[PDB]
Amino acid sequence: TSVTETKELRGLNLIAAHSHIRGLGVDADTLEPRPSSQGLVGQEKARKAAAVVLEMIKQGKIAGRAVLIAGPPSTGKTAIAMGMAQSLGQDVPFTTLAASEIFSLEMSKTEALTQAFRKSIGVRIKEESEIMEGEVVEIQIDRGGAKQGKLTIKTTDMEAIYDMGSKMIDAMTKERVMAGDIISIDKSSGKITKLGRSYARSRFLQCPEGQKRKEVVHTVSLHEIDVINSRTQGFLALFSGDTGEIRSEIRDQINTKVAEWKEEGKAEIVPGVLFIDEVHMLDIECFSYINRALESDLAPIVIMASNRGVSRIRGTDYKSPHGLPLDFLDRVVIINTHPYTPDELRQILSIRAQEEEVDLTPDALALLTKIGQEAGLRYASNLITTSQLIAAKRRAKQVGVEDVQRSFKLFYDPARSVRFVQESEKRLIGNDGVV
Amino acid sequence: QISEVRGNTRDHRTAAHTHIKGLGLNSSGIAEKQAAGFVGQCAAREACGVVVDLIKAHKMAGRGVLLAGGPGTGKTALALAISQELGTKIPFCPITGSEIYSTEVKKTEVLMENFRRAIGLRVRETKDVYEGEVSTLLIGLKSARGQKLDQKERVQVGDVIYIETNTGACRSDAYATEFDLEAEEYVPIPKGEVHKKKEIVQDVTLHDLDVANARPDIISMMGQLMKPKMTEITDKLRMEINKVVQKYINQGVAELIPGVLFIDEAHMLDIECFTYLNKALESPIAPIVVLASNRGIATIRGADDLKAAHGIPPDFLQRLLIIPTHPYEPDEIRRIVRIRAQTEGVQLTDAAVDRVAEHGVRISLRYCLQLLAPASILARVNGRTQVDVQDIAEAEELFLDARRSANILTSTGGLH
Amino acid sequence: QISEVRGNTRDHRTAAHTHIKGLGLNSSGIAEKQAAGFVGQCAAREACGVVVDLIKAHKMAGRGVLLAGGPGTGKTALALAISQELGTKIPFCPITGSEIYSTEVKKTEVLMENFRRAIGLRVRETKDVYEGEVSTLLIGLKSARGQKLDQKERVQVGDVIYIETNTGACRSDAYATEFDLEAEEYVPIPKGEVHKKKEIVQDVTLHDLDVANARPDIISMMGQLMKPKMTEITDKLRMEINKVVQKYINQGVAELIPGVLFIDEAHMLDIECFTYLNKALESPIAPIVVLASNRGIATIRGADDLKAAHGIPPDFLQRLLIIPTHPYEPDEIRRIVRIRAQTEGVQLTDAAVDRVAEHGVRISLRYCLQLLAPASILARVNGRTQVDVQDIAEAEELFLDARRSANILTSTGGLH
Amino acid sequence: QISEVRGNTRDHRTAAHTHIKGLGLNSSGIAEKQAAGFVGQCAAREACGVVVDLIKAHKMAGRGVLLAGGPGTGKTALALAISQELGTKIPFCPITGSEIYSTEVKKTEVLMENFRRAIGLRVRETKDVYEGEVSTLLIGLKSARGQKLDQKERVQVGDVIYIETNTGACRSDAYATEFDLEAEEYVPIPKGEVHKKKEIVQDVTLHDLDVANARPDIISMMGQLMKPKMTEITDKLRMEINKVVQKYINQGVAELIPGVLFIDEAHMLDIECFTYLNKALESPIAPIVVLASNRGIATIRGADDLKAAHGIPPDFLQRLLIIPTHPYEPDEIRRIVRIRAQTEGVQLTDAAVDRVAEHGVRISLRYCLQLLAPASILARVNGRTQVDVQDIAEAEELFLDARRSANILTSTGGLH
């Protein structure tokens, strides 16, 4: 509650859908990817390309060069970026962003881009903190107005119950905390860390002996340090009309102390990863900011993604591949994703059903794959959630084809919804056939 | 600042949906062809049910609802049914995309105000108050008509006190002299009895609390767009409401209940609006965002002529759960017309209902439903108690529909 | 304010031009087909020589340079060669037109900052300093490790002094008591020896002086876009730099040396930018403006759809000396690839150089040059010390070029 | 502001009265010729007893005490005995009339300060404190060395708390991060144990509370007349002491105990001083004013040469209860000398006591008592442990008395 470490904030608005990805799924010596490993499935060339890119950064063969992931919608662009992010470490900052989010009436584009980059540059300090280690006995979740829960954690000598806030419950669910797990909670940061499990489950550390003070490494982004030393953003801040902008005087104060600690040796700067979805949405001014920022030594890995082949360079009257400034295209490393084969699609949806704890009948997944083929992975992944509740209403043991048929009939994908609205207002072809 | 808060609602918006009591579904989540005010639109009503179930199951993490259909396909009605199925006295805020275009108010500032109209407070209270002008002499206070075993505060005997059984709280007019002028801290003796029991029940939205505290008597200010500036509700005021609302929840007195923000003409919203809504959907406290579009393909406002589905950007469309709303059959229209007639008090012949249906077929439901009120006047003026086919035929000629109105004005060979 | 100034350069920009040592011309101004890192582009290299000669002869009164060619035709390289041929450690500032589009910084304010990066100071000094804590008793001062015939200033014996042989300049810690608190004007005794000889040699640009004096320890500020405002370098600060720089020149200590401002994507600049550059070319102190365009016909930014040569307005084009840069032959490309390989440390088979050349033929030099680094990783990971044709074939599939990348995304009958 | 207050006393004043333990009276209020340090002065000691009885009976409504006698007749001693007979640790403030004549401080402002030195606080406390960093989980707090069924305030679990059993009161260093800088509200973990029992006993005067709160470490300020201004104790500060003292009494924690203000050289006080004392005697809270005069007839200071009794104005004399103090017999003096010797540690021969008595006969007791200390030095320097008649004879010649000192200086036929 005093601070919030980089680990628990990793890809905040995009983690849930990409929860299964534990890494890039590649071998360390030969960079050859395994067909299906570390969550990722069948995007071999892109996964190998990403692996070669990550090594180039480590080796220092590229500098001030951004990563571009071009491919059709729902082809693992956001997934491979998360896979790259995971392979750098859990204590490496990872910021996700839709290029549209820069254009808001609340804050300036410069502020939005500043916060984005500040969130992806971590500050590492070794400091004393009270660490609560133990065995999970019972986790309770009951969702002021929002989630409120209880964690019953034990050591061989102590038995205690702790009330949890919305932020903690989220971090616990992010780390998938189960009754029986051996976890350590940083009391200053709120950092949940899976160490082991006291008793095996679904095919190995013993319950701790003895809350203890330890010299621990704390990685906290520049944006969080800004937030901590700024006025506390109160309850209902989103609907209060208060802009999330950070006062320059506070930023100056933090930048000087961070520069002091780096020089003194009290701190080391940990550049992470900044992911920008919908890059075709950024303007000429935005890309210039990215240029200036990429020239810095503390610059994070700027990974960005586009679904559009050719787009207009926003702010100019010129067009280009993915709508990137022609000077910017030269520096960037382009990685391409392609559509999945029906067999490649079924594995992905089956993994997402497991991450959602939904049991599909062999035939329900088959239709969920036919749906994924035509209307993409995104819409299909949303259908699992709806099918779960349509089956629950009729009290079913598993989600059947009847339920997947219902979700698809009740809820439309964009291609059918446009086709609906259009044909309902105007008839293109008359009863005789004439247009 | 205030506990006794008066709630305000824009009733003109929910006027045509006086009959919609709910979705009209069964136990297994299947819509009955004619139930709770609804006639047809079964699949869309069922899909709205799956939605109210997902909200109750807490699976609408950062998801929205998109009602895609033509004009008068019961979109605003389904949106209202969602708030009704969600529970009792749940906030429902229906707004259009064109409303956001304000000359003095910022696009997102109006969006923020309607979000506050869609977040409420359920205050269930039974205040066991003991008030009046005051271990020996344990209890003893007097009211204007009464006097009545048993924390210790900076107050002496002979002062007006107010203490509740559940929560403890804190000089009288009786001892005030005319020689003491304005140094005064004197309060009058409380009216009624010492022991008071009040059944306090309030269903007010954040906006109702803001508008009440903006007032330093207010009905005229409600019935007015008094000043061009409208600088009454401020950031500091909103924060003060939020802090005192949080205190009420922490005491377990009030329930923060998120409602339904319904945005019709969703294509009118720009990128800046959609990014405000993206940030909103992220919040757990946030209400459900239900969008509506009668547009198949529309340009993205704030984008370089990028035409997309329903004029909703890809990033925001992803989050939305698209529900299609179908047009009605002449028989289906007749039922709706009849339901509207009985709610409005008017009554017409089966033949007059038939002609109203004929207008609901060519032009939407919305236009033909407007034909009841003038025909009621036309029948009553003649000396009738029931509206006939002649009065519907007169009203259709007296009051024209937007499309028919424009075509004759152009005509003084029309195509496309 | 400061004499010991640390110079800063954006090395990422001059990274691909580590091999260009100069233009590679002879005594009579004719380019040798392969010299000083260059391969071919003889006529353009010769034309760049005529330019560096005109600057040295002082005939470039208010004239510029326009490098017209396609992508990867050695424009940025020729621009760098111009600074190298002009003399030793001459400022070279390569920027693109798109860089000028800053959200917080005014279009001409960024242009002004890069002009300061292209105007330098050559400080050749041999400071014969005699410092330490002090016609009878002519000379006598002491240092932290030493003590050592021979204007008269407001300083007494027992004070720390600093006087240079070429220019005369102006209480010690030894006599400071703890009873005297903060009324203090006490300085410590200088470390080392009394007689000091320093070989002071500085090649810093106006921008290096501004950034140093903006700092009231700074490496992090250099490795950061710390604040969104960036209000450190101000008009008053710039003026103060200019006044103290003018003093250094008037003393014959420093040389104000104008460098090369290279602006790639010249068509991106507007009328307001071009009028800033017109005013710049007028100044004698101003550096050489070298523009670059890969556009034949482009619209004048800030003009009503007036399409002109290279997107440069007529008034500014007049001033420019247009030099055309030609594409390369597959043999010419192979040489460049080989030179780049040896500079980068990588080494590949003649067959792998052949495939890289094949990509440099269809797509530009810039793309195929990017194919070396991943193939080096691909070969080393396998267990190779030399890159083969198989690794170039793998790298071309792993890392795509902008045109090829877009075409497959559109394909999910492409023409024009 | 502070509970733990350190008391300060001007001990040099009460130095010669180390032997006076009380008045030395019996049960029926009759003075024993030799008791509680006293020798003779029976009637005056008895009269002082009647006075301490009247104060205890509350009959000294607005009355004072006037001790009329010659120099060294035990006036200051009787004044001290009054405070001792009044009770345990009762404030006693002995001052002279000449003290009031301050250059920077107003005549009544010094009188006001000595009144505060004569009004105290008896704080009898047994604090049952439970402190440390924090119906389920009823009690649980930890100290630096310990941890330990069972109002509800704005404090969460993990914060440092302090709550006493008799009166309820209100973030820890353990969760404080280095990333959070100066936004800090973090307190360290309390040392010792959770359950603490303290025997709090304080006997401090209003002045001790003022001087402690004037300090924002202070012993030097006590051992100094640091600044000529001395603007530390202010009206606002005094009021703040009075308000917090009143709170301590209203809680029944402390007892406001009025002491004894002894004013020697009473004739030195003017009309303005006497009117300040008239207003003081009126107060019930006020201490007993005990005045002393060695003057028979003296002019009223602040009056037109109006000579009155003891230099006290008629209006103020009325209020006073005049007690006469008689001179002593050579035998009576010898006893006092012996008592003083045994308290001071010194010891002398009966013959040396006889000579000291001879000086106490002609000159006062005060002078001859001063003859012990130098004679002790004179005997010890010789090599004696006991003082002889020769050392008293030497000390009388070495150290002269005011009258004898002046007479020889005039002589270089003296009368009247």
Ligand SMILES: Nc1ncnc2c1ncn2[C@@H]1O[C@H](COP(=O)(O)OP(=O)(O)O)[C@@H](O)[C@H]1O
């Ligand atoms: N190769 C893959 N392996 C596993 N899951 C994948 C893969 N590609 C996509 N997914 C999953 O499919 C869903 C949609 O794909 P996503 O990565 O978001 O698409 P996009 O290419 O449009 O960024 C997500 O839940 C994502 O994790």
Ligand SMILES: Nc1ncnc2c1ncn2[C@@H]1O[C@H](COP(=O)(O)OP(=O)(O)O)[C@@H](O)[C@H]1O
């Ligand atoms: N299925 C239905 N059952 C009953 N009334 C309906 C139905 N569909 C529409 N209506 C009514 O028709 C009128 C206009 O329809 P409305 O809800 O405004 O649709 P839309 O929002 O698509 O224009 C309202 O009075 C509405 O309650």
Ligand SMILES: Nc1ncnc2c1ncn2[C@@H]1O[C@H](COP(=O)(O)OP(=O)(O)O)[C@@H](O)[C@H]1O
């Ligand atoms: N004639 C040449 N000789 C040697 N290297 C060259 C030559 N032409 C281009 N290059 C190199 O090719 C790369 C890309 O060319 P560049 O100078 O950026 O051209 P442009 O500015 O026209 O895009 C650089 O590494 C550059 O030094």
Ligand SMILES: Nc1ncnc2c1ncn2[C@@H]1O[C@H](COP(=O)(O)OP(=O)(O)O)[C@@H](O)[C@H]1O
């Ligand atoms: N009756 C007495 N018994 C004992 N000591 C006495 C007596 N009278 C005077 N003294 C002592 O003699 C000294 C001087 O007398 P003091 O009290 O100052 O008298 P005064 O105030 O009249 O000058 C003090 O040490 C005092 O205690």
